[PDB]
Structures are given as structure tokens and as C-alpha cells.
Structure 1
Amino acid sequence: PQTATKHLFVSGGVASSLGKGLTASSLGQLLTARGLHVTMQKLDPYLNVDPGTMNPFQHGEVFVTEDGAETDLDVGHYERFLDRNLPGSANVTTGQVYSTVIAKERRGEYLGDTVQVIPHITDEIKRRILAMAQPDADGNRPDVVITEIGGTVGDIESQPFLEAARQVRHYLGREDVFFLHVSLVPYLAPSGELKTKPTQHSVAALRSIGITPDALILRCDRDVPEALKNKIALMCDVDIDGVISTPDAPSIYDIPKVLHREELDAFVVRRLNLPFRDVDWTEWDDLLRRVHEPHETVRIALVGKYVELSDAYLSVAEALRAGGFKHRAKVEICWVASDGCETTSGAAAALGDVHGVLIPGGFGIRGIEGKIGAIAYARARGLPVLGLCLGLQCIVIEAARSVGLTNANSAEFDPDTPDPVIATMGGTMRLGSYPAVLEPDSVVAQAYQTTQVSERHRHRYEVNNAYRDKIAESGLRFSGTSPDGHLVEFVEYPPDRHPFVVGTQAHPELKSRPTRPHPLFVAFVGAAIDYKAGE
């Protein structure tokens, strides 16, 4: 019979941004390849009940699940490395826990007690952790749950989750629980030395709350010397087999290979006494060939907020690269500002050297006229264009203005527009998976190679059915809809008007994986390659 389910806790020291979520994802990929069944959880110590209120240009994109949960973006790294649809239960926040305990208290469920952080908050967190280990709807019980604890050890907001993880160690014992601690080793250029003292103080801080790490991951810009690992092992009371050197890798897809070279997964498997097996690399070896040995390069403009990389489009950038991997092409992202495209000369300057334009969606944007300028320029030049949610809305507005409805706009951006071609059907936010039907041999039907699809949604405005007949005077096809046809889901131009100009109301980048590119990103990068070839 199957063993007891193991719990592995991932924690971080010195600083955030050390990549412990990619560490947890790579350890999940490794343990999955050894034949274990892994499930994953993130704990977020912030008080927002979900990141749907948070600014994505400051705090990164909101990930959306099939069940329509708005989650932290680390759940997207879990999805991309596991290739699994994760539930909304995969993300916990302090705001959810406190709101739940206070609601139970106001209903009288604690039978007249004083309600406290310990036990009642830590009990709610511990319940949410132990719930992950229960059998799924198909009867499968995980072999391990990997739980990543957000923040830094030493943060006031981190303390309840670390106390609950300690209580899980006490309840299940050291045979069923493993603690992995991520820490920074800085280099000082004037004296030319790596400093171990920050890791020592971080492990001392962790020990002061009753947790001893089973392994240390040392984050550094260069390989940590053996003598320094020995000093760390000695001072931190950690097995030298558990002090792992992890210099920064060229891509996130190398991290599994790095962790396997150091034998972290073998250390974990031995320590937890799990059913050992060798890793099979064949598919991740094919991935890394497509990563590191591309046959060609193509440039995609991303018409976003600013001319620099932002986690606001992390999953769009990853989906573009994955769509390139299918062709063995390097997709270089040219981050273009929306506002430089507002003038037609400015558009021709910024969007001039690129081979495709992507118009990304999301909340946290105000004003869209520059994106409509980018679309108009791209259609004039004959570039391929992929518009995601708001990109569809901009394509429909640009079409409406092209048919002479010069003041036509989204009611979200001109409530006084005489022709609200985009309007609420504040309306209702559509969230999560909805089905669609595609017109046969429509461009999107060729991309999916089917007439029936489902995609994840996060929007509250719809294409105005009152304007369809006028918009269609451009030749635009409402080629994909809700199954009743009531809602437009996809728009396309026929192939003889433009080679590929497509918008979708959905967020398909959330369904993409490096091992399984999404069909539209494949077809879009294909049209970009064909443009570069024809130009």
C-alpha cells in the first residue's frame, strides 16, 4: 500500500526574490520524474484576500485557474512545471484565514471561547495544509505535498504560517516532514570574498522559532567553494550532503538539471524514505534542446505599459517563448510602450523592426488609444497581430473607427461615446473556463484544429451585438462565440485581408506550457515567421 503522505516545506531567508518558487517547481518536476505523485501549495502572508485588487505592474500578473480563482503567479510556475490544472485551494492568504475565522466567530461556532492567533488561526492554516493530502475526485492521494511559505523568515507577517508548519512537524514527525531553506550568499567586490554570515544569521532566526532546516540552498552569482559549504554545514548544524550550491542559471528550465547535479532530489528521497527511482530526462532533454539550440530568431513587439520586462506579462512572455519552441525559433521580445505608438510616426518608429505585435490584456491600464494606433499601424504594414482580451476589444474598436464610427470607443474608456461598440452586457466579471464554438475552417478553427474549445476568462465587458452588422462591413468575422452565439469570443480577418490578425476574449497564455505550447501562440509565431520570410 501507499505510504503516508510527506510534507516538504520551502522557506526563504535574507531576502525575497531568491527564486524559491522556481526551486519548489523544479523539485516537483524532479520528484514527478521519479514516479511520485506531487501536489503543490503556496502560502501568501499578505492581507489582501486575493491579488485581484493589487496593481500588476507593481506586484506582477494575476494567475487565473480553471475554477476561476484569482491567484498569485507562482501557481503558474507550478502549472508550467507539473503540467497540471491546480485548484483555487492552491493559494492561501492571511486575508482569507482571518476572514474565515472572524466569520466563524460571528456565527458562534467557537462556543463562547476567546479567539486567538494560537490556536485558532494556526489551526485554520494547519487544516488548509493537511487538506491538500486528501484524495482527489479520482481517488488519487499525493505522495508529497510541497508547500512554499511566502515572505522572509523574520517577517512579522510570516510568523503564523511558520508556527503552523512547526506544528505539522510535531504532529507527523521528522520522518514525514522535510524543511528546505533558501538563502543568499553575497559577494563583496572590494575584498573579493563570499560572506557566509547572512546565511548563519538566517538559520539562527529560523532556529529561534523552533525549526531546524534539513537542507540549505545557497543562492549566489558564482559556485560556492567547498570550504565555504563546509563552514556553513559546521556552523548551521546541517548535513554537508544538504548544503546545495545553486548559481544563477541561464534560464529557468535549467534549474532542474542544476538541482539534480547537486543531488538535492536524491537527498530528499533518501531522507523521506520514498520509493526511489531514476529520473527519465528524455522529454526535458528535448525541451532544453529547443531552448538552447534554436534554428532562427524572430522579433515580437509587446505593446505594454513600458519598454521593459514586467511580471505583469510573465505568462504572456513565457507563452510566446513556448510558442516559439515548437518551431525551434528564438522569440526575442521587443517590449514596446503603448504610448510611443499613439502617433502613427511613433508607431512606425517603435513597431518598425518587429515581425509581430502582441496586444496584451489585464487590469491596471487606463486609456487604450495607443494600442488602437499600434493595431492600425500593424494592419497598414500587414504585420500579424494577436490581441488578448483587451486586445480583442481594441481590434473591434479600431475596426469600428475604420468603418467611419470615428467616436466609437469602449464605454470603459469613453462613457460618453455616442457609439459604445464595447459595453457591459458595472456588469458581471466572467471568471474561469467557459466553452466556445468556432466557425468551421475559420482561422481560429485551423489553429485549434477543432470547432469546440474552452478558455479561461477574466473580464466584464462584451462586444455590443447592436454593432456587429456595422463592424462586419470591415469584413471582420465573429468567427468564435459562446455556444448560443450571444457572445463574441474570437474575431478574425479573412486570410486575404490579412495573414493573421486575431483577438480572443480569453487568456490563453494561462493554458500554455513549455512542454505543450498553446495552439494560438503556435499559429501566431508561425505567421510572424512567415512574415519575416516574405519580407
Structure 2
Amino acid sequence: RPRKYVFITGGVVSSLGKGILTSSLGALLRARGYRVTAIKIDPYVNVDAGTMRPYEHGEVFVTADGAETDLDIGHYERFLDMDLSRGNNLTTGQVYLSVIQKERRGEYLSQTVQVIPHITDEIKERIRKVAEEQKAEIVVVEVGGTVGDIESLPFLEAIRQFRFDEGEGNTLYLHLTLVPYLSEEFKTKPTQHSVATLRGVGIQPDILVLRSARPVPEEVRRKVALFTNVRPGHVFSSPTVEHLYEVPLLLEEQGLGRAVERALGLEAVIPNLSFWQEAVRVLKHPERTVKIAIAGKYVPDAYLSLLEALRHAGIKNRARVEVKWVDAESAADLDEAFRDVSGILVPGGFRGIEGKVRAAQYARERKIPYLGICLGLQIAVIEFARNVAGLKGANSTEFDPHTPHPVIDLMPEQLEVEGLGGTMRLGDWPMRIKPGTLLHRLYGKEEVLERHRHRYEVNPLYVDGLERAGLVVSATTPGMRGRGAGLVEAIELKDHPFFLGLQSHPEFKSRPMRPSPPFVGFVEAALAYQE
């Protein structure tokens, strides 16, 4: 059977929730039993999100294969419930670099190389290759940027060519626009202009989705349909909502799923959205409520996946997890700052370390549930080494390269591989959990995979000592490709309600349908502490 392509573009302005739209349509299609995948096109020149601030100006997601991508990929994995790869984040830098390298190597056999057809060919081929390896019957492609700008032009053209290449019934085009609401009057002029510009570059949308404060009434939607050339029944609303998980349920309700099936010539399949329905029920009507503090170094979307993991966890506990932001780098005031808190979470980063060290001490001495992710584990290791192992001024050579006790340092030279020096650990790394530990109790397995993004590890040489002082290493890595063999992956304390730290980013793999165990435990313990 023919593979189907659903393209999604945006108009008028950006920030209309096009990523959640892509994710929501992907979920609707999966709830129908199809094998699906999503590709995020980012018109920027960056080859990948590798040279960008990992938290600062938005979170940089990390795929199982170690790719550093745009945060939308995380939205896709969570809504489609699947592992994506670096091929799912296509950028201008990738496409142009890849094409330029080919002609310098003379691979274009002496022809003059141009945006069309060469850059556009490269783009389509990349879309098909990824869809091929992930064996998808339906692939949802989101074009980043805004129709009408210069950057997305090569991509709008590339996807326009799919209609002819794939044959009738195999491609569908959706365009998301902004419909400001004043009067109680909906202003449709901007979407009329956006669609007109779109047709100008050669694309006729099949389906329109109108972003606005509230749903666009039928009368208005019909008018938009007639002046855009789109069937009235193919114009939908995208109202602002309280919970993102409402989006798919809402879109299916209006008939977007039905419209897409038909437009693609697929026989109607009744979707099973029971999960989304229950998740939204739990979200609107929590059974309980507990607040936890995030002593973060970056107090938007810097912790997108993190906050998502907590939400997936609260649902699993039928509880609304309220988040308190504690600067941490801001001194002695830990009693008030953690008063109405029942759990303390220290997330990753790469400045305010000393402030976080204090947050861990307080949580360890006051018996407050503590979860440490990436840097969060290192901090707990650092403060433990100081205040329990008596290692004066213990630290990571990241913050203090001259510390007398580098309990945390770069990849030991003994476990390093040729040509990989100075490269952090990325993507899935195997983790061997220790039976009888808290970790083991949370996961329920001995071998699991968790994603990483860091270049500092617990110094092997200080392990024996820290363990004697009471620190527990509930997990390590048998290594990978002969690298980092034996490195500590998790730590915890026995005489404590809940004190756990992991070197990986478990938020990344967290899914609404499968909460990350470390977070499920954190929220659970937090509830216990609350009484």
C-alpha cells in the first residue's frame, strides 16, 4: 500500500501551537492503529540544536540515538508514543551542507547546482529516507517558520512536489492560521491573505485550522472556506485550552480525524482515545494535590520535558503536582523557601551550584523527598562528599577545576575511547539497576535504557569511600562501545523517605502513557510526606 503524507504549514504569525497540532494529529492517527512518524522541519541554518544553549532559550531534546534536536521532537515522541531519530529534525544547514559537500566532491557530475531541483531533491529524499527506516504508513511533516518568509521557501517548494511524485490520494496539506477575536467579531482577513500567499508559492491547503481564543463559529468558518477554496467541512478550530491533552480530543470531536482519513482515501477507523480521555479527566479533577520545588538554574520551556515528566507522574498518582520555582543561586532562607513543599527536585544544567548544594543538604537532613537529574545527581554527590564523607571543598572540576577532591570530573582516561575525548555521553546508555534498592523498586527491572547529555561523571576513585560513608550506588553502566564502563548512573540514601539521583535525563523518555519511574516515585513520596 502507498505511504501517505500529511504536511502542516503555519501562517500569519508563529507561536500558534503548530507543534502540538502536529503531535495531536499524529496521536489521532496512532489511535487508529496506523504506523506513524513525524518530521519537524526547522528552517534555521543550525545543522542541529547542538551548538545552542541546552536550557536557556528553550530546551534541547535528545533522541535515543544521541541527537540534539528541537523541542518539538519531544512533543512528537510523547503524543505518538515512539522513539524518533535525528532524521526527524530536518534543517536548512543539514540540507545545504549536505548538498554543497556533494558538488565539491564532484558528485553532481559537473552540472550547475541550484536550490531547485538539487536542494529540493535533497529535502524530499531526507523525508522519505526517515519515513522508510521507521516504516510509517502515514508521515506527518511540519514545516517550521511562517508562510510568507524567505527561510521556509525551499521547504514549501519541496513538499509541493510530493503531490506529483506520490500520485493522487497520497498527500494532504493543512495550514494553521491566526484569527484574532475582537465586538465578538472574528477577523478572517489575515488567514485569507496567508492562504493566498501560500497558493502563490504553489500550494493549495486541503484543510484549514484556525487558531483563536475561542472556537470559530460555523458561519465564520464557512466564509473562510469559500474564499480559500477549501471545503467547509475541512475548516476547523483550535481554541486555547487549559490542558494540552485536550487538543487531540477536541480536534477529533470536530472531525479532523475523519476528514484526514477520507482525504487520504483510507476507510474509516474508529479511534480509541480512552487514554487521552482519562488523562484529561484526571487533570481536570485531581484526587489530591502536592507542591514540589524545583531548585533550578534556569527559573520558558527550559524544562519542557521535565515538567512533562512531572505531569505524567501526577496523573499516575491521580494528583495535581504544583511546582514552586526556587532560584537556588539566591542565602540562608531554606525554611521559608521550602515551607509549603513536599519534595525538592534539582534539575540539570552546566552557575548557582553552591545554592543547589544547600538545597540538597536541607532535603537530606530534613527527610524531604529529593530527586536529582544530571547535575542534580552530581550536586547530591558533592554535598554528600562534603557533609558526610568529610571531604572538605569537594566539587566537580566543572565548577572548581582546582578542588582537592574532584568527586565529579570528566570521563576518566581509563574508560575513554580514541577520538571520543571531550565528547559528552548522548542518547540511550544501558543502566544496570541494583536489586533491593529504591531504584530497583521503582523500575522493576535490572536492565533499562535512559538518555544522557553530559560530559562529567562521578570519579571512580571516590566511589569506595563515599559508599562507606553511607552513599549507595544503585546503578551503573556496563559501558557502551567500550566507553564509560562501570560509571555510576544512580545514587540514593537508605535512611531517608526518598532520596534518589540519576546521571541521565529520565524526563526525555517519559510518556503520558508510560510515566518515568523515577518521577512516579518522586511524586508518590512527595504525597507521603504531605501525609
TM range (shorter): over 0.9
Instruction: State whether structure 2 residue 349 is matched by structure 1 residue 348.
Output: no
Partner of 1:196: 188
- Contact 1:476–1:491 at 8 Å: present in 2 too? yes
**Mean Cα displacement is larger for which, 246-255 or 192-201?**
192-201
- Contact 1:10–1:181 at 8 Å: present in 2 too? yes
For 1:423-442, what aligned pairs fall within 5 Å after superposition?
423-424=409-410, 425=412, 427-442=422-437
Partner of 2:489: 489
Aligned letter for 1:422?
A: I
Partner of 2:466: 471
Partner of 1:404: 390
Instruction: State whether structure 2 residue 319 is matched by structure 1 residue 329.
Output: yes
The count of residues paired between Structure 1 and Structure 2 equals 516
Among 366, 369, 384, the residue aligned to 2:354: 369
Instruction: State whether structure 2 residue 413 is matched by structure 1 residue 413.
Output: no
- Shift in Å at residue 415 of structure 1? 1.4
Instruction: State whether structure 2 residue 166 is matched by structure 1 residue 172.
Output: yes
* Cα separation, 2, equivalents of 1:41 and 1:268: 18
* Cα separation, 1, equivalents of 2:200 and 2:32: 35
Q: TM-score, structure 2 length as denominator?
A: 0.94
Partner of 1:151: 145
- Shift in Å at residue 132 of structure 1? 3.5
- Shift in Å at residue 299 of structure 1? 0.5
C-alpha deviations, 1:453-474, integer Å up to 9, x for none? 2211111111112222332343
Secondary structure class of the residue paired with 1:513: coil
C-alpha change, 1:507 and 1:88, in structure 2 (3 Å) is same
Percent identity between the aligned chains?
Answer: 55
Among 192, 200, 206, the residue aligned to 1:208: 200
Secondary structure class of the residue paired with 1:157: coil
Partner of 1:238: 230
- Shift in Å at residue 452 of structure 1? 2.0
* Cα separation, 2, equivalents of 1:100 and 1:49: 10
Secondary structure class of the residue paired with 2:132: coil
* Cα separation, 1, equivalents of 2:162 and 2:478: 47
- Shift in Å at residue 437 of structure 1? 1.5
For 1:32-181, what aligned pairs fall within 5 Å after superposition?
32-134=30-132, 136=134, 141-181=135-175
- Shift in Å at residue 58 of structure 1? 4.7
Partner of 2:280: 288
Secondary structure class of the residue paired with 1:431: strand
- Contact 1:132–1:145 at 8 Å: present in 2 too? no
* Cα separation, 2, equivalents of 1:349 and 1:158: 49
* Cα separation, 2, equivalents of 1:112 and 1:34: 48
Instruction: State whether structure 2 residue 304 is matched by structure 1 residue 314.
Output: yes
C-alpha change, 1:218 and 1:83, in structure 2 (3 Å) is same
- Shift in Å at residue 409 of structure 1? 1.2
Runs of at least 4 residues off by over 3 Å: 56-59
- Shift in Å at residue 226 of structure 1? 2.3
Q: TM-score, structure 1 length as denominator?
A: 0.93
C-alpha deviations, 1:215-261, integer Å up to 9, x for none? 11001102212222122112212111111022112111111111011
Instruction: State whether structure 2 residue 251 is matched by structure 1 residue 259.
Output: yes
Partner of 1:502: 500
- Contact 1:306–1:336 at 8 Å: present in 2 too? no
Partner of 1:422: 408
Secondary structure class of the residue paired with 2:117: helix
Secondary structure class of the residue paired with 2:204: coil
- RMSD of equivalent CA atoms: 1.6
Aligned letter for 1:285?
A: Q
* Cα separation, 2, equivalents of 1:331 and 1:7: 38
- Shift in Å at residue 313 of structure 1? 0.3
* Cα separation, 2, equivalents of 1:395 and 1:413: 14
Aligned letter for 2:199?
A: R
- Contact 1:9–1:180 at 8 Å: present in 2 too? yes
- Shift in Å at residue 156 of structure 1? 1.0
Unmatched segments (≥5 aa) in structure 2: 413-420, 480-484
Among 457, 463, 469, the residue aligned to 1:462: 457
* Cα separation, 2, equivalents of 1:451 and 1:38: 30
- Shift in Å at residue 322 of structure 1? 0.7
Partner of 2:23: 25
C-alpha change, 1:263 and 1:27, in structure 2 (3 Å) is same
Secondary structure class of the residue paired with 1:298: strand
* Cα separation, 1, equivalents of 2:56 and 2:159: 29
Aligned letter for 2:404?
A: P
Secondary structure class of the residue paired with 2:152: helix
Among 492, 508, 511, the residue aligned to 2:509: 511
* Cα separation, 1, equivalents of 2:184 and 2:447: 61
- Contact 2:249–2:276 at 8 Å: present in 1 too? no
Aligned letter for 2:471?
A: L
C-alpha change, 1:115 and 1:169, in structure 2 (3 Å) is same
Aligned letter for 1:197?
A: K
* Cα separation, 1, equivalents of 2:211 and 2:270: 26
C-alpha deviations, 1:397-416, integer Å up to 9, x for none? 11111133232111011112
**Mean Cα displacement is larger for which, 295-304 or 434-443?**
434-443
- Shift in Å at residue 385 of structure 1? 0.6
Unmatched segments (≥5 aa) in structure 1: none
- Shift in Å at residue 173 of structure 1? 3.6
- Shift in Å at residue 288 of structure 1? 2.4
* Cα separation, 1, equivalents of 2:344 and 2:469: 20
